[PDB]
Design an enzyme around this catalytic site. Structure first.
Site, PDB file in Angstrom:
ATOM      1  N   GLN B  10      24.336  27.333  29.932  1.00 40.37           N
ATOM      2  CA  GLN B  10      24.541  28.775  29.848  1.00 40.37           C
ATOM      3  C   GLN B  10      23.313  29.466  29.286  1.00 40.37           C
ATOM      4  OE1 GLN B  10      28.209  31.500  29.658  1.00 40.37           O
ATOM      5  NE2 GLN B  10      28.111  30.362  27.730  1.00 40.37           N
ATOM      6  N   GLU B  70      30.074  24.788  34.670  1.00 37.96           N
ATOM      7  CA  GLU B  70      31.014  25.823  35.092  1.00 37.96           C
ATOM      8  C   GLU B  70      30.387  26.715  36.161  1.00 37.96           C
ATOM      9  OE1 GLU B  70      31.927  27.629  31.412  1.00 37.96           O
ATOM     10  OE2 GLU B  70      29.962  28.566  31.137  1.00 37.96           O
ATOM     11  N   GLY B 143      28.225  21.386  24.875  1.00 37.04           N
ATOM     12  CA  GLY B 143      28.538  20.058  25.378  1.00 37.04           C
ATOM     13  C   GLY B 143      27.717  19.630  26.580  1.00 37.04           C
ATOM     14  N   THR B 144      27.657  20.474  27.609  1.00 36.43           N
ATOM     15  CA  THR B 144      26.895  20.116  28.801  1.00 36.43           C
ATOM     16  C   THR B 144      25.393  20.157  28.552  1.00 36.43           C
ATOM     17  OG1 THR B 144      26.716  20.477  31.189  1.00 36.43           O
ATOM     18  CG2 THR B 144      26.850  22.448  29.815  1.00 36.43           C
ATOM     19  N   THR B 178      28.809  29.459  16.037  1.00 34.63           N
ATOM     20  CA  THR B 178      29.654  29.930  17.122  1.00 34.63           C
ATOM     21  C   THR B 178      30.802  28.982  17.418  1.00 34.63           C
ATOM     22  OG1 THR B 178      29.695  30.789  19.384  1.00 34.63           O
ATOM     23  CG2 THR B 178      28.335  28.874  18.983  1.00 34.63           C
ATOM     24  N   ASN B 205      18.499  31.488  16.443  1.00 33.93           N
ATOM     25  CA  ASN B 205      18.926  32.839  16.778  1.00 33.93           C
ATOM     26  C   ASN B 205      18.913  33.774  15.574  1.00 33.93           C
ATOM     27  OD1 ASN B 205      19.297  31.996  19.389  1.00 33.93           O
ATOM     28  ND2 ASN B 205      21.521  31.805  19.231  1.00 33.93           N
ATOM     29  N   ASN B 227      16.316  36.719  24.849  1.00 32.46           N
ATOM     30  CA  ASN B 227      15.842  36.017  26.036  1.00 32.46           C
ATOM     31  C   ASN B 227      14.576  36.644  26.610  1.00 32.46           C
ATOM     32  OD1 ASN B 227      18.116  34.532  25.626  1.00 32.46           O
ATOM     33  ND2 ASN B 227      19.222  35.293  27.423  1.00 32.46           N
ATOM     34  N   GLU B 253      -3.891  19.776  26.671  1.00 31.33           N
ATOM     35  CA  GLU B 253      -4.634  19.999  25.442  1.00 31.33           C
ATOM     36  C   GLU B 253      -3.708  20.339  24.281  1.00 31.33           C
ATOM     37  OE1 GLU B 253      -8.325  21.750  25.402  1.00 31.33           O
ATOM     38  OE2 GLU B 253      -8.713  21.642  27.560  1.00 31.33           O
TER      39      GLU B 253
HETATM   40  N1  GTP Z   1      19.380  32.878  22.843  1.00 36.97           N
HETATM   41  C1  GTP Z   1      20.558  32.692  23.425  1.00 36.97           C
HETATM   42  N2  GTP Z   1      21.441  31.771  22.905  1.00 36.97           N
HETATM   43  C2  GTP Z   1      22.645  31.576  23.490  1.00 36.97           C
HETATM   44  C3  GTP Z   1      23.004  32.297  24.612  1.00 36.97           C
HETATM   45  N3  GTP Z   1      24.240  31.906  24.978  1.00 36.97           N
HETATM   46  C4  GTP Z   1      24.667  30.952  24.121  1.00 36.97           C
HETATM   47  N4  GTP Z   1      23.692  30.750  23.187  1.00 36.97           N
HETATM   48  C5  GTP Z   1      23.728  29.799  22.069  1.00 36.97           C
HETATM   49  O1  GTP Z   1      23.811  28.458  22.519  1.00 36.97           O
HETATM   50  C6  GTP Z   1      24.838  27.780  21.830  1.00 36.97           C
HETATM   51  C7  GTP Z   1      26.026  27.649  22.769  1.00 36.97           C
HETATM   52  O2  GTP Z   1      25.593  26.867  23.853  1.00 36.97           O
HETATM   53  P1  GTP Z   1      26.120  27.104  25.349  1.00 36.97           P
HETATM   54  O3  GTP Z   1      24.963  27.428  26.255  1.00 36.97           O
HETATM   55  O4  GTP Z   1      27.186  28.165  25.399  1.00 36.97           O
HETATM   56  O5  GTP Z   1      26.712  25.676  25.752  1.00 36.97           O
HETATM   57  P2  GTP Z   1      26.886  25.301  27.296  1.00 36.97           P
HETATM   58  O6  GTP Z   1      25.540  24.953  27.868  1.00 36.97           O
HETATM   59  O7  GTP Z   1      27.551  26.428  28.041  1.00 36.97           O
HETATM   60  O8  GTP Z   1      27.816  23.996  27.224  1.00 36.97           O
HETATM   61  P3  GTP Z   1      29.370  24.085  27.614  1.00 36.97           P
HETATM   62  O9  GTP Z   1      30.098  24.985  26.651  1.00 36.97           O
HETATM   63  O10 GTP Z   1      29.971  22.705  27.595  1.00 36.97           O
HETATM   64  O11 GTP Z   1      29.470  24.640  29.011  1.00 36.97           O
HETATM   65  C8  GTP Z   1      25.164  28.633  20.631  1.00 36.97           C
HETATM   66  O12 GTP Z   1      24.289  28.334  19.574  1.00 36.97           O
HETATM   67  C9  GTP Z   1      24.896  30.026  21.135  1.00 36.97           C
HETATM   68  O13 GTP Z   1      24.511  30.859  20.071  1.00 36.97           O
HETATM   69  C10 GTP Z   1      22.123  33.227  25.137  1.00 36.97           C
HETATM   70  O14 GTP Z   1      22.435  33.871  26.135  1.00 36.97           O
HETATM   71  N5  GTP Z   1      20.898  33.420  24.542  1.00 36.97           N
HETATM   72 MG    MG Z   2      29.611  26.461  28.189  1.00 40.90          MG
END
Ligand code: GTP
Ligand code: MG
Ligand code: GDP
Ligand code: GDP
EC number: 3.6.5.-
Lengths: 49, 442, 298, 430, 430
Positions: B10, B70, B143-144, B178, B205, B227, B253
């Site tokens: 995500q 997902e 998780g993923t 979170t 963050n 982002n 380098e």
């Molecule tokens: N900088 C930034 N951090 C994010 C963002 N979305 C989620 N996070 C952070 O990433 C972590 C959550 O990870 P996710 O990306 O939601 O996990 P995932 O890859 O979706 O894994 P699954 O839940 O199993 O599908 C937390 O620390 C959130 O604060 C985003 O859009 N930008």
């Molecule tokens: Mg997720």
């Protein structure tokens, strides 16, 4: 160039103002709906009496 | 010249949207893949090649894959504005998530999807003639991202071997959180990431929120701001490959200069002229002011204070209108300062780079337009403090086996927790030992 | 007491309410014209609409059944009692409250010419924030009960608000109404028909041989058999309407709905202008004659 | 990722009718089944709850079961009743008699094969199945006995899917039936083994919500079933719309349950505003968080102040900042730190969704796993033991065929559940 | 820097209604709540007393509490009553019975939790909270008992903020109730511990202001409450508008109280003058200072000429020279030197604010700490001791549950307060 940057910021400000007005109107509408429900209940009671 | 980007989960896909937005606007490719040009001569402009390849009809397409378990986020990408830029095969989606379980990503579900990913990477690598690394964006809290990121890095590391893999990684913040299970996933991620990455850049963050509150004037920031900032940093680091300059710096380098020993590959990142448009007309932005800025702890993108450690190496990237004499004068002034200390075995502590292309301004962006900027990545012993607090939170949860039954039921031995926790403990001891002055041991 | 403007309003209500030249008004007219939906207590929701009829009977019937009607003096002193009771009201202001409650209850003012529907905002003003998204209703006057009985046929949510009602001719302004404007008058509902989401054109004439139209405001789910002959004559499919010689189109504007927009739409904002400027800058740099910021490709 | 719903007994069918009205309104489906929506965002996930009939039509993935047809005839006569597929209505020929043993042993085994046949026919049509959703009361007769029977059969047949239940439990004060303790005890015994996650609601708590917060003069079961339909449709909202931080029923379960027996949760929904005080307060994240934790707004009689939070989850709908959410959840955990279990460093999960419920700018649904739930079970167990010692109405159940040993087993199992909650409730730093 | 107002009992609700009318007029807030002002200077500090509700509106940060709703229904029916948030009105179902013990022990502890919940909800919403402002009468029933109860609870929960009170106290000349001495003595005992700074007003002084200065033929409580609302809105005026020499409630407290028990102050307000007389005398700084120090214009029955000034403060409103203020305060201190306590080298603090109250070119409010305030308490204590020796009405209070020992403690504490003031008076040294 930073002049044009400021102009775009001003446009975004106007857009969010419009959204705020929309949401206020929605709140007033929901209050009106609740009042209508109360009106219907009172009418039914009066008919019974 | 070229590099291929792999976005997982995500955070990695959402950060990818900001990255490709920036790279499109910086090179000038249309959202549909076109590239208008009215002059018939002067077409010899290969700079896109680092990130795009052209078809025989002249459409541009970008060197990226998007990986998620997902569907929703990639389907949002499929229906958005950039629909026509990507080939639909690049947007890869599974059926169901790893449910914040590292075990589901690594053992049960990622083993099915991983071979498709490897086939896609091969399809990219066949359309190459000088690949010089992979850029990977992920968060270790979910998780993923943890499970499939580890599995994919392991397979990439066996198949491609020596080729470099550079990770941009979002670690769980020290008090913002979170989800409950963040410590287990972050420890288990870090165990795999130690062996199978060439440089790892750490982000928190909570630091980018503090920076956006203090320097920018944003009361209610959201992930799109963070982002866009990350995309700017990546664009600064890869600019050295793409445009003319006085002192170029190839991606090999960085690894040769920043990493003293093969385990010591975790780096801090910061960016200097984060300033608003209203502030921008009040200040000059000379070399020495921005050089002083990248060293202030108010500038860091990870919640650690480098004053609690010792620097081992610094890499300073200057882009825009800068002259080498000013870079040398600035670095010598920094070296004079008393709150900046280098380990006594590193006398020549700095690497410099100077590129002529100033940073691009994005129409919806929040950064001001500036004629020059500097970006810093540095390796420092202070990071050991970041791991110790994660280890304390893991120990707190693991002392009562608070959630372990999910992980053991989905297929992992309980022993794997203790192995990973002891390996990260050894990494902490490595950072304790490397920082001891040699004059003390005689 | 009552101000002279309120006296003028009362006089206008009495005269417009009076049929023939005789200075008497039937009680049936009193019942039919009076609007319960604008009663203050009913609007605030603390009184039943049927209780107003008993009050009207109690004040008026004693003289209505005796003299065959109501004169002007009884009506004026009815409003004097109205003002006396409004003096001790809870509202911050008193004069405006009495004025607009009289206007509301006695249904005077300006009404849309067919079906006599009171507009919410001025017809010449373009729709504001919320009303640019909420769908409107298709309404026409009934015939078995003559006009003036305030009974109408209603079909719900079949008209987009993308146009302004001020551009329509005066005899077709009342065909389209908002849901909030239907309160206070009898309604009869009609049933839709199964179709896809298509948008349909509305045409009419203003002079022999000259036609005017508004594009795509009627849903394709209006069932033409239930409508009267003329109303389904004015509704025609889009390209057939286009083929009609010498047709003019009313300007329409589509507004965004802030209830169904995502967060990722923020990314691609204002990019075509920036990329056009960037392409111009890069070709200018390639041609030469650039002395400030220059492109530094390869 | 599609859910199949099961509605059992009078309470379940009544709550279900309002739920499918609310869901059909949110996705713009006419009671004829025709799509009438106004954005593509409504259509693109309609599959989650609806099946597609040939050219346009939508059918709701629900099975209706009851022992006397009075309720089904009432729902078929309702305004949306036509949408339901006729073959999905299952009914017997004689009532449950408000007796658990009839519903479980006599009319249960007679009907149960036809419900499993219908659910499998409905389940096997999906391309990938997400969990089931079941609504029923525990105090009734056919609801408790046949609902738990069906739950056990579905857990045998689909052990890898999710099982989610909403359950109504008898107030100690609003007694509509004399034999409530038996039906409740046996049903809780069935639930603690079979269910994956179970939410509990007191009708008394819904009355206190209506009277204190909404100040309604004359509430009806339509209002209580609207509150329930609101929370039920809120839990699934992230399944079926885009958002900045997606969440899922399985992710909620994984984050809420520390140990597998501790799966009973409290529910609340925050933006309830009184009929005459709406112009006075704008929606904002502080307002939602403050209302969300107020015990006036919680749907059980036990109050959190007598227990401690193990974990909590908040699902937010609307366009809002993540910073405000994270800092609010940190500030609430830090300021009230004695009410949060100390061996977990952060107890609250957050999630954010772009699409609010119609006519509200923002909303949040709250799920809480709190040890004060033990007070409901203890109260039910006291009432059960008082009657059982003297055999107050037992001959009906024994005449159906139950061994007396079942009651002592069920009592012991409920007492052990209460003990397990009690140990984590009273721990302290020692 | 946000102020919270509390209005308690009948007197408190009436004074509050007139105060919020005057403040809403000064900031140009329509009785519908819409801002309609004509300069940014009005808008830029509205936050101090108002919170912003959605689409324009402002709501006043006040809690209204009373034991019988008659008064509350009267204030809601008043011309500005609609502005108040409905949830901010707290009332019971049976009266205080004009009895302090009922108000303190029986209905107090019954109601107080809902008031503390509202006050905490309101306080924690401020980004930075300044002190509380409290209005109540000491002679009443719910005002004295529940007001002092609430004050004690707020001092437990917010000991670092400011607690400020305006308080009405009975008279020996025009009493409405026989049992006034008990309620007054117990309330003054509670107040001297809990309060940070307290201003005292005698209704007899407001009658003499109205009859002598304004020459009203038939004054009503609206005039008395207008005088009080004028001084109340004046003390905080420098907090919320710019000026050449800013001042604050904390700076007033730090400059007026030499020792922490000596925190009871007298009040006056200067540009009072009858509609007939107003054509005869223009405003100037000598005129305001002369009227300001005339004992005819002071709101207590005790006269300064029988005591000594420890400290004093003057807050000036208007565009004016600093030279006239400093030289006037020096000239008054030098010419009347026997009435100022000699071990303080300068007793008066001045402050200047640019924005006067509407329709006046200039105004000053005076706060004075003078030992002649001891005469009021001694008089009340005399009437209490006369009544108490004979157990005149004690069975009501003892029947509520009070020990007789409380009465002897309260008498001793009030007597010690009188003694401490008398000791600091000590005319001469040796
Ligand atoms: N900088 C930034 N951090 C994010 C963002 N979305 C989620 N996070 C952070 O990433 C972590 C959550 O990870 P996710 O990306 O939601 O996990 P995932 O890859 O979706 O894994 P699954 O839940 O199993 O599908 C937390 O620390 C959130 O604060 C985003 O859009 N930008
Ligand atoms: Mg997720
Ligand atoms: N909240 C709510 N409770 C209900 C409703 N209908 C019945 N109940 C309650 O459920 C219990 C009766 O159970 P019932 O549904 O009749 O059991 P059944 O006969 O097996 O279906 C009583 O406590 C009723 O008050 C409803 O529509 N809403
Ligand atoms: N100055 C002033 N005094 C008042 C007002 N209302 C009541 N009082 C006095 O306060 C005392 C009565 O106390 P009251 O407010 O009724 O006590 P409560 O019943 O607890 O609210 C009497 O001495 C009244 O004269 C008012 O509006 N102004």
């Amino acid at each position: 160039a930073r002049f044009e940057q400021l102009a775009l910021a001003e446009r975004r400000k106007e857009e969010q103002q419009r959204e705020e007005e929309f949401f206020a109107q929605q709140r007033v509408e929901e209050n009106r709906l609740a009042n209508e429900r109360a009106q219907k209940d009172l009418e039914e009671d009066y008919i019974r009496k | 010249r070229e590099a291929i980007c792999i976005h997982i989960g995500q955070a990695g896909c959402q950060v990818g949207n900001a990255c490709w937005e920036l790279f499109c606007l910086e090179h000038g490719i249309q959202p549909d893949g076109a590239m208008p040009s009215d002059k018939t001569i002067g077409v010899e402009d290969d700079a896109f090649n680092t990130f795009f390849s052209e078809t025989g009809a002249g459409k541009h397409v970008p060197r990226a894959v998007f990986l998620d378990l997902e569907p929703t986020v990639v389907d949002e990408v499929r229906t958005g504005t950039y629909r026509q830029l990507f080939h639909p095969e690049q947007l890869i989606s599974g059926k169901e998530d790893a449910a914040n379980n590292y075990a589901r990503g690594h053992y049960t579900i990622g083993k099915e999807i991983v071979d498709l990913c490897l086939d896609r990477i091969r399809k990219l690598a066949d359309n190459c003639t000088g690949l010089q690394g992979f850029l990977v964006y992920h968060a270790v809290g979910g998780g993923t991202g943890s499970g499939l990121g580890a599995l994919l890095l392991e397979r990439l590391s066996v198949d491609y071997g020596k080729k470099s893999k550079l990770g941009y990684t979002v670690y769980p913040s020290p008090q913002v959180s979170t989800a409950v299970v963040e410590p287990y996933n972050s420890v288990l991620s870090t165990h795999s990431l130690l062996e199978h990455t060439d440089v790892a850049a750490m982000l928190d963050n909570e630091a980018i929120y503090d920076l956006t509150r203090r320097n920018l004037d944003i009361e209610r920031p959201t992930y799109t701001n963070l982002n866009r900032l990350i995309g700017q940093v990546v664009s600064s680091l890869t600019a050295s490959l793409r445009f003319d300059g006085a002192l170029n710096v190839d991606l090999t380098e960085f690894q040769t200069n920043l990493v003293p020993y093969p385990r010591i590959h975790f780096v801090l990142t910061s960016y200097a002229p984060v300033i608003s448009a209203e502030k921008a007309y009040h200040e000059q932005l000379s070399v020495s002011e921005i050089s002083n800025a990248v060293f202030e702890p108010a500038s860091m993108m990870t919640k650690c204070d480098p004053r609690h450690g010792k620097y081992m190496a610094c890499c300073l990237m200057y882009r825009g209108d800068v002259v080498p004499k000013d870079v040398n004068a600035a670095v010598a002034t920094i070296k004079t300062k008393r709150t900046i200390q280098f380990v006594d075995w590193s006398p020549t502590g700095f690497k410099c780079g100077i590129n002529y292309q100033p940073p691009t301004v994005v129409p919806g962006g929040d950064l001001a337009k500036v004629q020059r900027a500097v970006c810093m990545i540095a390796n420092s012993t202070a990071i050991a403090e970041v791991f110790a607090r994660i280890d304390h939170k893991f120990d707190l949860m693991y002392s009562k086996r608070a959630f372990v039954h999910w992980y053991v039921g989905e297929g992992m031995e309980e022993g794997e927790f203790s192995e990973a926790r002891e390996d990260l403990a050894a990494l902490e001891k490595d950072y304790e030992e490397v920082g001891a002055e040699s004059a003390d041991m005689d | 007491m009552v101000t002279p403007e309120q006296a003028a309003l009362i006089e206008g209500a009495f005269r417009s309410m009076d049929r023939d030249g005789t200075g008497l008004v039937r009680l049936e007219d009193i019942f039919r014209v009076f609007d319960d939906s604008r009663h203050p207590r009913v609007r605030d929701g603390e009184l039943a609409p049927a209780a107003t009829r008993d009050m009207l009977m109690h004040q008026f019937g004693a003289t209505a059944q005796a003299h065959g009607g109501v004169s002007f003096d009884v009506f004026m002193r009815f409003h004097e009692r109205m003002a006396e009771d409004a003096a001790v009201a809870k509202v911050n202001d008193k004069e405006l409250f009495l004025t607009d409650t009289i206007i509301g209850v006695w249904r005077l003012g300006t009404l849309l010419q067919p079906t006599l529907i009171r507009p919410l905002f001025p017809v010449n003003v373009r729709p504001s924030g919320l009303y640019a998204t909420q769908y409107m209703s298709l309404v026409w006057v009934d015939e078995v009960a003559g006009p003036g009985s305030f009974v109408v046929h209603v079909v719900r949510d079949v008209v987009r608000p993308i146009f302004s009602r001020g551009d329509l001719p005066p005899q077709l302004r009342g065909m389209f109404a908002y849901p909030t404007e239907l309160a206070g008058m009898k309604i009869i509902e009609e049933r839709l028909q199964i179709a896809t989401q298509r948008w349909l054109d509305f045409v009419w004439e203003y002079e022999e041989g000259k036609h005017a139209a508004v594009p795509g405001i009627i849903s394709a789910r209006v069932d033409p058999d239930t409508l009267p002959q003329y109303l389904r004559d004015m509704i025609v499919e889009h390209d057939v309407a286009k083929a009609i010689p010498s047709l003019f189109f009313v300007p329409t504007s589509v507004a965004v709905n802030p209830m169904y927009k995502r967060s990722s739409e923020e990314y691609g904002y204002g990019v075509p202008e920036e990329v056009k400027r960037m392409s111009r800058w890069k070709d200018l740099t390639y041609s030469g004659q650039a002395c400030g910021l220059i492109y530094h490709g390869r | 990722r599609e859910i199949v719903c099961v509605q059992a007994g009078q309470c379940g069918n009544q709550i279900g009718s309002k739920f499918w009205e609310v869901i059909s309104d949110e996705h713009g489906v006419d009671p004829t089944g025709t799509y009438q929506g106004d954005s593509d965002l409504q259509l693109e996930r309609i599959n989650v709850y609806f099946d597609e009939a040939t050219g346009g039509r939508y059918v709701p993935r629900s099975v209706l079961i009851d022992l006397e047809p009075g309720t089904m005839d009432s729902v078929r006569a309702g305004p949306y009743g036509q949408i339901f597929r006729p073959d999905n209505f299952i009914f017997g020929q004689s009532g449950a008699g408000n007796n658990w043993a009839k519903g479980h042993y006599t009319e249960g085994a007679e009907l149960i094969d036809s419900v499993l046949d219908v659910c499998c026919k409905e389940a096997e049509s999906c391309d990938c199945l997400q969990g089931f959703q079941i609504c029923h009361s525990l105090g009734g007769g056919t609801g408790s006995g046949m609902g738990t029977l069906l739950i056990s059969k579905l857990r045998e047949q689909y052990p890898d899917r999710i099982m989610m239940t909403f359950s109504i439990i008898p107030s100690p004060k609003v007694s509509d039936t004399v034999v409530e303790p038996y039906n409740t005890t046996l049903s809780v015994h069935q639930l603690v083994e079979n269910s994956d996650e179970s939410m509990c609601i007191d009708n008394e708590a819904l009355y206190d919500i209506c009277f204190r917060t909404l100040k309604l003069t004359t509430p009806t079961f339509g209002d209580l079933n609207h509150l329930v339909s609101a929370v039920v449709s809120g839990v699934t909202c992230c399944l079926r719309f885009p958002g900045q931080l997606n969440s899922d029923l399985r992710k909620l379960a994984v984050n809420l349950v520390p140990f597998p027996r501790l799966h009973f949760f409290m529910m609340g929904f925050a933006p309830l505003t009184s009929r005459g005080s709406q112009q006075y307060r704008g929606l904002s994240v502080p307002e939602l968080t403050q209302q969300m934790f107020d015990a006036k707004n919680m749907m059980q009689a036990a109050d959190p102040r007598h227990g401690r939070y193990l974990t909590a989850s908040a699902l937010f709908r609307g366009r809002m900042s993540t910073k405000e959410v994270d800092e609010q959840m940190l500030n609430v955990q830090n300021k009230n730190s004695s009410y949060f279990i100390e061996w977990i460093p952060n107890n609250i999960k957050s999630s954010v969704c772009d699409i609010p419920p119609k006519g509200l700018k923002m909303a949040v649904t709250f799920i809480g796993n709190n040890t004060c739930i033990q007070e409901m079970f203890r109260r039910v167990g006291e009432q059960f033991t008082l009657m059982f010692r003297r055999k107050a109405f037992l001959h009906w159940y024994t005449g159906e065929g139950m061994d007396e040993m079942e009651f002592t087993e069920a009592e012991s199992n409920m007492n052990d559940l209460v003990s397990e909650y009690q140990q984590y409730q009273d721990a302290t730093i020692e």
